[model samples]
Target chain A: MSVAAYESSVHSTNVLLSLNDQRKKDVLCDVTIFVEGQRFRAHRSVLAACSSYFHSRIVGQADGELNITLPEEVTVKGFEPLIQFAYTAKLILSKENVDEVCKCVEFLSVHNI
Target chain B: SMSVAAYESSVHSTNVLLSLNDQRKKDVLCDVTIFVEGQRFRAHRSVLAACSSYFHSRIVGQADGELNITLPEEVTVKGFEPLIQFAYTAKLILSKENVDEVCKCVEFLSVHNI
Candidate 1:
């Protein structure tokens, strides 16, 4: 038998949690997003990986620093949870905001949400 | 078992890491640039810090800008490349020829849990 590779069961979760902590602390956030004047900071890699909309914009950019202003259709009420979900893998939706969130989801084209 | 409204995707974290690894290969959205023995590697600080304690201390308090790091003389590319790969993919591949150097680098970096 040949020994080749070792896989860690917890590494994925650990990395995501650490990334989420970094997001919360605004540490290593490379992109700034604005939705209706509400500013947010995030990692482009995370956003691109989680959302198709972000992937197209971020993966092709050459600049080291990026600032994105979302279109009028997107709103903070819908976006907040989506970004949170991107980082934490947890999307918490309330009845009051579910409609708004779903609209933003369509705009984002994020299947995971 | 009682059903609830909450749901979690079992593959979300895995997909995230896979995508990030793909981005790393394409040099997309990578903020940290590391040089080991004149060889350059691009990566994200969040992923590095999450996997290695050494990176955590180095990156935790730094300002948000393009970060360039040069590894000390003791660390070699043979060792570090695998560690960074493991950080992104959660898989470590070792061969008899390079295991010793990789272990030394692991000890120097204090990377635990493989």
Candidate 2:
């Protein structure tokens, strides 16, 4: 009957997400991902939580010298949103390019995008 | 220095919301019906409580039954879609088309996320 909720956790996570977004925007990402020779940067923990592909690949390695070359199935534009959505939880899908994004999400095992 | 285990709970929670958006959008645990100019928009009480103080009072106070509220002063329910989406997903896609109403609604709700 009565609703019991924790309001602070949601707020804190949102703050953390904002910080994560700032982290990405500032190009302070610790992991460098090379997709088809194009470079992208992202946080280690964010990728690990959101992608098993990255979790297994980068989990144990030390920072500052890790570079991953993604499979050819992963495109720069498609893979970009995967990182953005993984950290920020914002996915902007368009009619023209939904397929590539879906393919990338599936390849990365990123569920519930 | 934050440990990996200690700092990761936030990302897990964020991922939960991001994952839960679909479930919350379609078959969410919505117990409140907001009627804006006779247009009914369903929403979960937890989301409202977490986002809007206006709805926090209304949904939490009505414990015995499903809460039905209305916003007659508003123009259309279209404007409230993004606001409700914000409450559920914490992701509000604001554009020139919705900036005014989003501002007005967030102001009315006293949401400090601007």
Candidate 3:
């Protein structure tokens, strides 16, 4: 199999999932986000908690979540972006949203999801 | 001309490739051949390795997309740690069916449920 290739400009963890009828039913639609070359570790309990939310969350998508989550940083604001990251893998904020995203991603469960 | 292939400049890096698989799927690259179990896949080597290591694998991409790949002879310790660590962590994460105290803080994360 063959196709065009892209080098990930940023590194982070992005998970997309659908657990319920309304959920998106996609898992890590943006896999590159998580392969950001850095480590994201947490308890399976925390990760599963996050994973459990993936379905409800994707259906419950938000913006600006990708930048933080993908970078694996944890200094982000509000539950909204965090919640968004648990699902869609799309970051809404602009102006090189990489740093903030890194802070938030650091807060990720580091476990199961 | 600089010889690119089989060029051994340094053992400091691993030659992993994750080029975009397609354009329509912007976030996704076709070389990322796991989501579709039944289709043509660009993941001939590394993807296979990931499958062997990860439960739900995703081909994140290469540092550079200038080459094709063959299954690696072995996963050498090249540049990163998270994936390898994830392998260990994901085991516990998936095993207990939970994501517990995997991130305790300051250098290491743990699996609380277990």
Candidate 4:
């Protein structure tokens, strides 16, 4: 008649860390993103789950190989840390590159920083 | 501490998992297709491999593309549904009637430590 439920405090963080490690190793990366001629490989599911831009871009697409090229407005300097944040949930910005990073954030429409 | 700034979202992981579970429900951006007993499920390999060693071993070293896997007949949808839900949400809900079935599926999949 009743259901028993259990939740783990560490499981979500562990999963995110493992996924970031896999991304670092270029393992199981289903999507390739090119920004300013620099290539970055990542999982579309992670990106879609993290950013609405990616979600809209990825949804209804075929389940095969996916490659995306950002326009001139998006630069590698700005886009790199955002993708890293998508996987690791940590974003590092300095005074020198904060402007560019913010530009990419706007272009990608990523929320929660 | 210094002039450099860093932003960390305490709820980012939780939010990401929530979105991922939603995506799983809608079959959005799922790279792997798994079939069990004529029941088909779609998921991301990264998420599956992170949660279970069985999936990790199978997914690693594989080429890039959509992955389709057909699980053995013993694994039933009744057992698997909760496991996959647990995998994505870190929460497992089991009832008196389904606990045994879910446990058997957990052992078969070698998923442990929650």
Candidate 5:
């Protein structure tokens, strides 16, 4: 029988599974997430190995897969929280946008993930 | 000038607004939170208060003006007080995180009063 990419494919499959923690709604807003120097090709399984790495800097005890630099300057006061949402997908807007956070997240996707 | 005599006490806190009858009650451990700039540092207390001697935001001692660094909000007690939750905004962290915030505001707080 012909073979598929075995070991590497299995690892990738596991990584893809982790994405379930990352709500689909949150993912839709982060247009680009650059991690460990690898940029995922947008919803593609290419980053299955590195998917659980979004909010490494702000929340977790250990640094995640990447130490994200703001790819560019975020001008408004809201940018800090946006950077956080982009990372953990754990949006805490009470301190940041206060009222607009829920609306902003809702506008992006119909899925209440 | 607000002189604390490490003499024994800045306690006996008489309202030094040029009166002799001002009380000299010791700024007790219970009241260090009441002292002008001693709440957050230089002493060991179970519950810290805003910086001290008097509860004013800035301290003035003739030439002894200094910035008091307390979080823009307030203290975090046993995590049981529900009514006083705080906001962890960047600017608030920037204020409490360093000496810069209060020193920067001193010129405004102590200009006329003292």
Candidate 6:
């Protein structure tokens, strides 16, 4: 009969969630990502800041491209939620897609979610 | 810069609250099972401990493997839904349909901290 403790901050969570939702709805996106020929618009700053995978690739001025084709191992379905989690601090987990998510997150090394 | 900076640090606290509500609905690591009027629901033990003094003592002190607390009183099942949701979301939507019953249960439960 014991309980764990938690900090009371959530601003970062809210801003990121809204930003993720905005991106999903085709809002003010600064970068585009191509996965398996499907396109997704995203904020370059948020993605690079939050993800180590994006940090090296997107942040380099020499690698300036609005759109990027992801690696063959990354599927559109699997990699999409990882983007959402970067901004929103939330991810949807289902029995159908859980394994794919794990593989993608592991590859990206995006751990904050 | 300040405005953007301020916005970045601020979160929609409602998101965490609503997420907790959704998490409870999804049957995650819910530590406590409460039974009221023969209806059962699962809740986070830490949240219960933080909010209620009654739970602080009962949950933290007792060395039970599973804390099964049963409120054997004449409690309205419908009314408790909002209460339980409010406990997590910290938001309560009041309407003529359920306000009185909500009041009754809150009074009974002695949710003074809220």
By DockQ, the best candidate is 4
**TM-score top scorer:** 4
Q: Point out where model 3 deviates above 4 Å.
A: A1-79, A109-113, B1-114
- Tens-digit lDDT track for model 5 on A1-113? 22111112122122222232332433311124443343332221111112223222323322112234333222223343333433233334444354443443333221112
Of 1 and 3, the candidate ranking higher by DockQ: 1
List where candidate 2 sits over 4 angstroms from the true fold.
Answer: A1-113, B1-7
Q: Write the per-residue lDDT of candidate 1 for residues B1-114, one digit (tens) a residue.
A: 332235566678888998889878988788889889889999988888888889888988887777888889889999888888888888999888778879989998888686
The models' CA-based lDDT, in order, is 0.84, 0.61, 0.27, 0.85, 0.25, 0.60
In model 2, state the lDDT of residue A47: 61
Across B1-114, the per-residue lDDT of candidate 2 in tens digits comes to: 222111123355556555445545564333467888787777545455556677666655454345678876754555677777765555656666667776787777766464
As for candidate 6, its clashing pairs are A11-B10, A11-B11, A14-B12, A16-A87
Backbone clashes in model 1, listed as residue pairs: none
Predicted candidate 1 versus true structure: per-residue lDDT over A7-101, tens digit per residue: 98778878898888887888877889999899898888898898889888887786567899999889899999888778777777777668778
Per-residue error (Å), model 2, residue A23 = 31
For model 4, the docking class works out as medium
Chain A TM per candidate, in order of listing? 0.91, 0.78, 0.27, 0.92, 0.26, 0.77
**Superior by TM-score: candidate 4 or candidate 5:** 4
Q: By DockQ, highest first, what's the ranking?
A: 4, 1, 6, 2, 3, 5
- Candidate 6, which segments miss by more than 4 Å at Cα? A1-113, B1-8
Candidate 4 per-residue lDDT over residues B44-87, each given as its tens digit: 88988998888888889887776888889778899999999988
Report lDDT (Cα) of residue B3, candidate 2.
21
**Cα lDDT over the full model 1:** 0.84
Sorting all predicted structures by TM-score, with the top scorer first, yields 4, 1, 2, 6, 3, 5
Error of 4 at B68 (Å): 2.0
TM-score of each model, in listed order: 0.89, 0.46, 0.19, 0.91, 0.17, 0.45
Off by over 4 Å in 1: A62-64, B1-4
Give the winner by DockQ: 2 or 5. Answer: 2
Q: Write the per-residue lDDT of candidate 3 for residues A17-52, one digit (tens) a residue.
A: 121111233222222123244323221111223533
